[PDB]
Amino acid sequence: GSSGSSGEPEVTVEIGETYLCRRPDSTWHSAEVIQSRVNDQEGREEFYVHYVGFNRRLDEWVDKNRLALTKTVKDAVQKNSEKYLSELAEQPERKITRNQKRKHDEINHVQKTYAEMDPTTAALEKESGPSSG
Beta-strand pair 44-50/27-39: antiparallel
- With the C-alpha atoms ordered 84, 89, 92, 95, is the resulting torsion angle positive or negative? positive
The technique by which this structure was obtained is NMR
Distance CA 124, CA 133 (A): 29
Residue 21, number of CB atoms within 10 A of its CB? 22
Distance between CA 77 and CA 68 in Å, rounded? 12
Q: Which domains does the chain have, with CATH numbers?
A: 1-133 (2.30.30.140)
CB neighbourhood size of 22 (10 A):
18
Helices (H) and strands (E) in the chain, counts: 0, 4
| Exposure b/e, 75-100, CB count within 10 A at least 16 = b | eeeeeeeeeeeeeeeeeeeeeeeeee
